[model samples]
Target chain A: RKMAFPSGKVEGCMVQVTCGTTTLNGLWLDDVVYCPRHVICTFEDMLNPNYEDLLIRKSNHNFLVQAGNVQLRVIGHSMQNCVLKLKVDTANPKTPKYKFVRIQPGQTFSVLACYNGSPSGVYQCAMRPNFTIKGSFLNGSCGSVGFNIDYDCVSFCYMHHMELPTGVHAGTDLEGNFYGPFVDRQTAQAAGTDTTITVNVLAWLYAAVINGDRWFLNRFTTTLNDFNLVAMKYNYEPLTQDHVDILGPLSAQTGIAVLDMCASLKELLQNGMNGRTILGSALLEDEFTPFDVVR
Target chain B: FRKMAFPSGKVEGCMVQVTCGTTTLNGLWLDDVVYCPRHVICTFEDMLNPNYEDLLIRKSNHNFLVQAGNVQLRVIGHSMQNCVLKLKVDTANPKTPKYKFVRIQPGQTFSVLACYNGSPSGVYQCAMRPNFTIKGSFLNGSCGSVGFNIDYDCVSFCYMHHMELPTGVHAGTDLEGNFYGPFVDRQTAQAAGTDTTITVNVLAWLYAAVINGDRWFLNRFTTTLNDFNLVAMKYNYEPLTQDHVDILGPLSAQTGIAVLDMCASLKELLQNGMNGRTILGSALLEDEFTPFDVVR
Candidate 1:
């Protein structure tokens, strides 16, 4: 539902914005807000600073923001102040980013996950067992007794605030620095309305993050291990300690676990493998590098 | 890589993770609940210890809490046949106890049992059973705020059994070409050295453990994933052959895999998925609670 604005806003102007497979048009006043959706296309604030940043580029009338191992793009924008691109990606999850609360005194706090876009429940303060609640799962509210008091339930957007790792992230200045599309929808909803804004980050690409973990632990592991197996396969010997030895001690200065370091280094198994020093003695015969044996 | 032997059969190698300590045996190793089943239960002396270590529960009357598997059992009202209970489960934290009020009405054939997190019946029992939601009181402490409608009819609790907090576990085969691990308890695994150099070895082992546990859990369950699954699956107590890994339901029987996908999910935990507090162990072969995870 859109608010009705004056005649100049959204009367007949057909402003179209696109991102990925979705498209939005703003033909009316309030409809102008539909150009450039907030979650993936909120460029009004970032445009001023990132506009000069050479890393982020415009494509098909949209903006692309790339972070380490994560990519976010603004697909479309229009005159109606509406951003139609709807996507979100946050590396860390299970975190509650933003919180909202209302109180009626000694009362119950409740919410609907389906309507709110996430799971939330109501309860009396653990300090006051006397608090009670009344509600339906689909939609409900709760509070304390003997005083119409406070109401609270935690809710958050899927794409929470996160900092990309300290390596050279892609598509930004000074190491691809980027913040996420926050739950600014609260700005519109806090005035008191039940409007749920969803950020549609692709779930499949996220699946590839798991693939990243897999490739790190699986094929890359096998490929590295195969280096030795092939040795034994050629009618071998046991007088060998192999490179995995130096790989560990190589990063002795950082004191970080080689696996934690190696988990991401597989990306460097080929290309711009960041943190080259962490590779141990793979390049010890000369310069330091990663499991260069696989090469 | 270890947990327990079931009271009957199936569902071995599960864990009940808590604050002070974790259980080597799954709280819900009981397989036959319908016919004649042995009850599996254990009481925790308040994880947020009120005694040896005090938390908010010290000011309350409940001396300790019990777990029917990962489900934290909070009793408010009780009778001979059953008790009104509030249950909590964390898909994120296994030690999670943030529970909302719930009541299983009188005369309802309600059963409270522990779970292996992967068991179809224990956590699945709540879903398959009837809606036992009843009107009950909110018993937080001494305050019993009455008339709060309890909705126990829905999915009350389930362990996000496949959750893996940040740990450097990876797969590696023994010199004999078998999957190897001290995946559960780090008893025989890497050193606890915080020294810069000591960490390198730790990371190497962690990645190897992840790979080892990965193949054991995912491939071992169904006799897949090359040699890592069945051939590499070594054990401590019972030397499990490929047939032992061949346990599951009829559907899994035909497909050469378990129907519930305990191992498949088990692989996702160490192999790297988003689930938190993943399997604590009884890995591909060995066993014990590894001193890993939010090791505070």
Candidate 2:
């Protein structure tokens, strides 16, 4: 008669086990028997479970195996005989299949596959002592599994957002002016106003002292041209009055209010000039000279 | 009675008038008369007679006159309308001199002598003015005046001499082994230089870290520790070269040699470490110390 092992444990075997006359699709058997006093134990008391056959393949001369939705169970006594039961489905026919091999204690094995013609893929293996298993599955399934990978553009974020290439030219447009995402155009314009005020005050001071209005004209024109070149280089918009206020006064004096005014203008100009130089250098080449024309 | 004779100028113009009880030659209508340079006395009974007349006499000569009683001694001489009286007093006698008088200028006050002799003689009566003097004579004929010009040296000399004494010398000591003059002391040295270095270095690094880039390590290690702080970290007897090598060698590698040279003399030392110590000896020993340590 055919026998089947249920989910729970059972004791007392009265007869020998046999395969049924008809083919059983999803049936398994397990036996737990001890030798009667002085009686010899035989193979009839041992249960052998059959595993579903799986086909493994080789690509690029590298061994690879795959399994999907596999289920495994142990049906054996802790004190005597041991049996392992496994169920697997070969769902993806084009993908390779693998058999569930019993891993011995202290044994190690590796799974290899070609990824995009390069060797890369997820692998699963278990060490029997701890029964600890680890597996990595590659999303592309071609070969090697990449880690901690990130994709970033070489240019700045604003440059990248505009889809420009790398290098200084990325900041400029076809017309050779700068264009980029700024916090606020109005705020930037206000800052430019401060800068312009500084430049004007420095020019005025230089003119008053040197008695030549055009004494700072060269410098001023150069600075303005520099601003334009910077705007063109960094792909930025035109400067506003706030930018000029950055270079407001021209001198530093203790208590004289006008001299202090000049001092403030000087300080603003210094900061603005530095910022403009930095912005220009970042946008254009170092050799880019702004005030080439005499005017 | 034995009468003491007064000084010559003391009794120059003594005069007596004749009244009804005492008469000197009455009933004599005299326009101008002169008295004889002598002493004369007349009986009152001769002047009490009803026929006795008094004369308004004028003196016409200059002479010392003394009258003990009523006298009628008139000396008639040549016209003496311009004649002047003369008297003299002798102050050369050691016992007692005559005619003592004190003349003082406006705003002058008086003083007397107290303690007679010393570097600073004590004054008995104090006098104060733009200028002052005290004159006194002893029985031994020693008399003189001490004049003090009040406007010039008396006030300023006393004040200035006392002020300029070395009261505040060597008042303080600093961590750098310098002795500060008066008005500075050990506490001030600790507070100003040592503590200030710590505070400034800490604050500078903190600010650089928060506001600027990650420059705290760079600035603190290079500028503060390697450049200045290491100098102060040495023990009294340690060789300065040992300290410099220990501190500056590693710092030169961390900060570029060029940047290190910009702010300090680390370049010579760095080059010395690469080459030899001979070049650095010239730079460091040229002066007692470089001002760059205290400057910026």
Candidate 3:
């Protein structure tokens, strides 16, 4: 549903659009386009610095604000304000590059995921619970619009606040590094038996993170890589003293000194695997980075 | 975890280490409730004390209170002397109190004939307390709380049995995983039997524990006990497996009693000499005294 406003202040042209049971309050901008799932505010209205962020009471709609070449999209349908800063790109009027990718609370962007435009300078993001970096800031290729970054991605996004999903054992450390499955190390190790080795990959990944194992860290892109690529590459079929020796010292150097990487892997195996996908594809799909095996 | 007691009769901002089943949680006690990271609030059962060495008692009438399984026990309060734990239960009859106050003071470990409603209900927790807190007209104390419940089906036993709190709305899912409740109390929740309808304002049934990442529901059923058609659903539900049975079997033998879940999933696992009583156990499972969430 598109509503056009005859040149006036947004407050004067404020109107409510009744979509099913939800009544949305949006400004009647000249090119303000509304959809059942989201509202798109484009052109002159989006260039305003002091734009009134849409208040979405219903936890089912994501809104986008676009002007010049940059498009700011707020993910997650929870009751929150859609806030973003804007700068007009007069040089490339149609496809303006992002000046900065600043994620505030209620607003989220993924690492290495494609936005409509590449962020120009330093792309900084704040961390939230259950946050994972699917892509690095340097690898953010220009891809589809909505696939920018998932709400569950990256280390940063400052907002009012939202309830962390149940069973999502996630946390952030003093070094600003985000990790999850926040289970005790003891419980994590108990979940994995000697016959079945799955969480061992997590221990390997933690070791990689601590010992600066570029080969192991390089393979970690998605859960698919964590589960299939790296997990299958190093088959610590039954954890021996050799595997324990490597982790015993390295585990103390990192947050795993208290954080349980194995328990997190166990929890991720249980509750975290569901609904995990890369772009439009599921986790088990052809979404994996090739890795070299140390063996 | 530190400070389970205060001389002011109320414990505020004290850290507590709780071991709930396989998970050990370090949390803080505020307003007599333990609050852990990620908004995990534990009232009684989930907040099992890992140790009682640091438990303290500054007053005479104050005692730390804890419950193990079906028995309501606590650490006895005394101004001086090493903290002594006490437990009393009616093994032979529900109406008659047969067991006297049994105390396990410092340096002494003991066991007794544990019975609930004349049946051998297993001892899920047997730890001494060293702290005291005042409750009602008397003082209470305990080292910690620990216990377990068995499922009738064993598998698919994860369910939320929370009471409504002012912090957030409490609700559960139906058979097909649809949202239900926000009901005023247990009286209203049981009244909405077999009704699968839901309103738009109700939040999604996300709080239901999805153990192993599999969605399971509390099997809706009605059991006749004490001349009442007790609508037993949602609350007091647990899924059990052979692993759980392996743990329960040993605990059952050691506690000298039989134990079963609220929904009775482990009915077949209950042995003859285990003194398992599902009829009375089911009623106890749904009782308001059960340790549950305020707003999960």
Candidate 4:
């Protein structure tokens, strides 16, 4: 019989294959989608990957979204932090009345965006995988009620996690003392408080992706499996660590490490950037699709 | 922020035509994946966003599918805003067009790409799944928008010529899942367990080639009897399995395991006529290889 292993490698990324007694090799790929669907929509169906903006996707760092308490956003270089037209009245959310504001320090933008003649009347801020405004994508009835716009922001922060040249040790000290345009984390230390400093920790992961620091990237990836349970606990809220941690702060103190790197990122974007196009498309890119003029 | 105004409108199932200054652009939107960034993203509460109609736009990801005048440009990424689009005046003929990330100010004129009538800019367009052992040949399949005859097309082109008349693995996957060694280097085969299966089959091919006296008609079978000893002496593999013997005992229908079965199976196709049970089986049977060669 022709032997066909259920799964094997794709572009150096070994998928669904048994590692056996062999040490698992290659970059430990995370939740990277394969088959995407039986319908093959790949480079075979499109143009070249835009190599011109390679680093921009990696380099453009992430930030926090502080919307009267909300989620999801990619921060830099994009004119629309999120085209989120979230609405809900204070009296009756079901009737529609709300605020529309762009996010900062965020890697995504989700909302109930339904235009005047959109054939829509209802909208929602977040829904599945679960109901987090940060991850929803369209259940908008094109109306004002029961609508959502929780499309997961597919941005650079998710893909190209780089590291600064100085590494994750540069910015923060033992205590989370941040110096950048501090937005997300609690300014003062409160151990009992589940610090959204977890978001700040993510900044470093974002830094690792931006700088393409293989050491930091690999370090965070390898070390994450061994994170302190309590530390990862702070990332989620309303307490009780059941099955929380969406896009985890899996590698514990890597947060403080990334904090200092965030400052470094700021320094480079401020000083190194001299009329250069540092922020471009945050599309999922790498060598797979060399964006140029296509077939 | 620069303020500009253009209506946010949808022209479904048709080419969107609009005139901007001197250039008249006409193109089709790939479903909801595309929109005019220079135009306003109209909303329900247009009044809330007082300046809603005046903002320009671009996507953080995804290529901008557009054709300005006769040019073709997918709004790919540029590190900076308003970076002068890298344009290739002609893609079909294929040339190393000079591309610099020149910036485009508001009034500046820029061209993304001049439509190419030749090839997909001679870029390697065809893709491949690592499943097959074929190296360097672009995966067999026609690229949509990404046009003809690049590296993948060129290689798969020759590869098709060697196989049946069809462009793909159809009729015969050429036993892609099975025939193991067209290895990276002979040393490479040793890395895995099932690999030796290939060497066993190579011995069979070597034996068979020497058989049938000149690779043509009837001189092949009786001579197949003399070849086995020559093969065993050379590779020293396991004695052919009974299943292997049962298939090849007839001399023509099949051969030893793994690699040799590939050719013997195809020989069945000519006689048995596309039988999945004959020789072996493949998911790609009857599938058509997308032609990679495109227009002038």
Off by over 4 Å in 2: A1-220, A223-225, A230-239, A249-295, B1-240, B246-296
**DockQ of the candidate models in sequence:** 0.02, 0.00, 0.01, 0.01
Which is the winner by TM-score between candidate 1 and candidate 2? 1
* Model 3 per-residue lDDT at B281: 18
Error of 4 at A86 (Å): 23
What value does the lDDT take at residue A271 in candidate 2? Answer: 45
Residue-level lDDT tens digits of model 4 in A40-116: 11233223323224223332222221112232232232211101111111221111122222222212211112221
Instruction: Give the distance in Å from residue A198's predicted Cα in candidate 4 to where it truly belongs.
Output: 5.6
Q: Is candidate 2 or candidate 3 better by TM-score?
A: 3
Deviation of model 3 at A97, angstroms: 39
Task: Give the runs in model 4 whose Cα sits over 4 Å from its true position.
Answer: A1-295, B1-26, B29-296
The superposed Cα distance between candidate 2 and the true structure at residue B193, in angstroms, equals 19
Model 2: per-residue Cα lDDT over B132-211, one tens digit each = 11112111111111211112112110000000112110111111212222222112222211111122222222222223
Model 4 has an lDDT value of 0.22
lDDT of 4 at B228: 43
> How big a share of the true inter-chain contacts is recovered in candidate 1?
0.00
Q: CA shift at B261, candidate 2, in angstroms?
A: 16
Per-residue alpha-carbon lDDT of model 4 for B1-296, expressed as tens digits? Answer: 00111111111111232222332223223322222212112222432343422422332323333443355544433221120122121122122112121211111111111112111111111112122222121222211111111121121111110111112221101111112223221111122221112222333333343341223211222323224434433433223334444434433333222323433432333344333331111211211111111000
Q: Which lDDT tens digits does candidate 2 get at residues A15-134?
A: 111112111111111222111100111233212211111111211112112211222122221111111112222222222111123332222223222222222211212222222212
Ranking by DockQ: 1, 4, 3, 2
Per-residue lDDT, model 2, residue A56, is 18
